[PDB]
Amino acid sequence: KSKLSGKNIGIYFGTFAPLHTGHQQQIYKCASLNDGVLLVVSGYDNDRGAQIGLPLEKRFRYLREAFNDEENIKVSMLNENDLPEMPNGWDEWANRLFELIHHNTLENDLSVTFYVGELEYAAELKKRFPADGNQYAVEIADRHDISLSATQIRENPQEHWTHINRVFRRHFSKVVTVMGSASTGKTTLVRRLARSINAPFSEEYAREYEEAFNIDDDELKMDDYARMITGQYDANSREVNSPANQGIVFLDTDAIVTRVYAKLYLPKEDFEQLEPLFRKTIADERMDLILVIPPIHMEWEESRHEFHEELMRQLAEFGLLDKVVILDDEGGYLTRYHHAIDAVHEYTGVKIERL
Numbered sequence: 001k002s003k004l005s006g007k008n009i010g011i012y013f014g015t016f017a018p019l020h021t022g023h024q025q026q027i028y029k030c031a032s033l034n035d036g037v038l039l040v041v042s043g044y045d046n047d048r049g050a051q052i053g054l055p056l057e058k059r060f061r062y063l064r065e066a067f068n069d070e071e072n073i074k075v076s077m078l079n080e081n082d083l084p085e086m087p088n089g090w091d092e093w094a095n096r097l098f099e100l101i102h103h104n105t106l107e108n109d110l111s112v113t114f115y116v117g118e119l120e121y122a123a124e125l126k127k128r129f130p131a132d133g134n135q136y137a138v139e140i141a142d143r144h145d146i147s148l149s150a151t152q153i154r155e156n157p158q159e160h161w162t163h164i165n166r167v168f169r170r171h172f173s174k175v176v177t178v179m180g181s182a183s184t185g186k187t188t189l190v191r192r193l194a195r196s197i198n199a200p201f202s203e204e205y206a207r208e209y210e211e212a213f214n215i216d217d218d219e220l221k222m223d224d225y226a227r228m229i230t231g232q233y234d235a236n237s238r239e240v241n242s243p244a245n246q247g248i249v250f251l252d253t254d255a256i257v258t259r260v261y262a263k264l265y266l267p268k269e270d271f272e273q274l275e276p277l278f279r280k281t282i283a284d285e286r287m288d289l290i291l292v293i294p295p296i297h298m299e300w301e302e303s304r305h306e307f308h309e310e311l312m313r314q315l316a317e318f319g320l321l322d323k324v325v326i327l328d329d330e331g332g333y334l335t336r337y338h339h340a341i342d343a344v345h346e347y348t349g350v351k352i353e354r355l
């Protein structure tokens, strides 16, 4: 189930940062021509992919998941940490690659077809066929378009979203988070933003937690704030990874806004016990634009300026200030929606109509 079955198989290379429609189209054509296909993800320790947060391992794992139900397609990893352009290193890169073939196949006396898209690779590869019983052959592939699409996807992700393979999409998603008091225009604001650009959105986990377990704000305890941290995060993850994500998604609240309600309203010894779960979660969050509703749930209502001042205190603590936009109105914009909807334009780049 984990080594390639057939007798003649073909080989397809790539950095795969990210994998996209182009690749897949070339791969299924490649699969229908052989009995099996060996994908080879190539990477080195600070390559184009790694620089944007998709290191060789991250790419490999995502690729394994992407082909997780294709029996006759195996994903391999060719790690490149050796000599540059004037090497005997082609000698070595070769048998690194031929190691991948021997390990991920049964059935000696194979018939291998390399599908290479760079001419120097085919020239240096043909010099280094090993003396097993396999008789390798090289064919040329048009990667002019495929490498060029990957270039554009990395540059403008939300412009080529539908061609990014779904496993890689969670990494390119823009994320807008709204934070604020029980001045919960935020929930209506979050919907109105997302539904105006057909985006998905999360809901305040605290509201759902309190209703399901049936407790008011004053009755929340340390054990409950921890359940709300992971609750809200999972809700937000669920949307970022949602199949209905079109490139940006909106989060109703954060671990920070639940940590503000937790430094307030919670004994200093108790709060200090949660700080590790708080770091772990806030570190696992990635936000692009943070919208804050200024002072305009029963216990969380009354302390608006208390919460709002502490919220900025914490937001500085985590260096998120330059992603923060405050939806004020007086003394610029007509409605806080107007201010907010235009903020999304500046921070994600989607087109919006005028009245």
Ligand SMILES: NC(=O)c1ccc[n+]([C@@H]2O[C@H](COP(=O)([O-])OP(=O)(O)OC[C@H]3O[C@@H](n4cnc5c(N)ncnc54)[C@H](O)[C@@H]3O)[C@@H](O)[C@H]2O)c1
Residues within 6 Å of the ligand: 170, 175, 233, 236, 237, 238, 240, 241, 251, 284, 285, 286, 287
């Ligand atoms: N059938 C199934 O597949 C199935 C069924 C039940 C459970 N599960 C489990 O559920 C999981 C599904 O995915 P997951 O929840 O583990 O994903 P995950 O927790 O691995 O994803 C977290 C990543 O997404 C980003 N992220 C998440 N929330 C964010 C936010 N609010 N803002 C910015 N960035 C954010 C982070 O950068 C982080 O690296 C699987 O790991 C699986 O084990 C799967």
